[PDB]
Amino acid sequence: YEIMLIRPKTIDDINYVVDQVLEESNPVILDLSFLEKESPANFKLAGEKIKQMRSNYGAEALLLSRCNDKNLIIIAPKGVSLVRK
Amino acid sequence: YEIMLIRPKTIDDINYVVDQVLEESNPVILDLSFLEKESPANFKLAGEKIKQMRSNYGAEALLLSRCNDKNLIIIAPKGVSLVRK
């Protein structure tokens, strides 16, 4: 497979992540810092999409890093396990 | 596959990462902050192992985050593409 890397800025980027996780079954490493400070409405929307993916499709989501200008999340689809070691 | 998550502390943990990338073909998300401040010798060793993996085995390595107490790297084996979007 592939691991996609993105810093979402628009609703189209949020739909891009939904499609990689659910249609392509590709993990996505995404930085939510732009949405967080530019569009609080799209940041809430992005989070709702991640909640639905985990609740209904078995996706795992992990926070990797959280500092000024960075909010790194990894979303793995059902089929790719995030294994803590 | 699986994506392994580790904060290496010993040489055995460094050999663990070599084996996941090269034998299991699993990507590894690793935090090199412990080695960096506790064993500069093992931090250099860890970096040499990553250079050899990329040079001879086609592994990709990406820096995801670098702050106080964190140095997050992702190592993808030949077969898993890290795709910037």
Binding site: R54, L62, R66 | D31
Partner: peptide
């Protein structure tokens, strides 16, 4: 602004 959509932290 919590990340209340995660299953854990690295």
């Amino acid at each position: 602004q919590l990340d209340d959509f995660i299953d854990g932290i690295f």
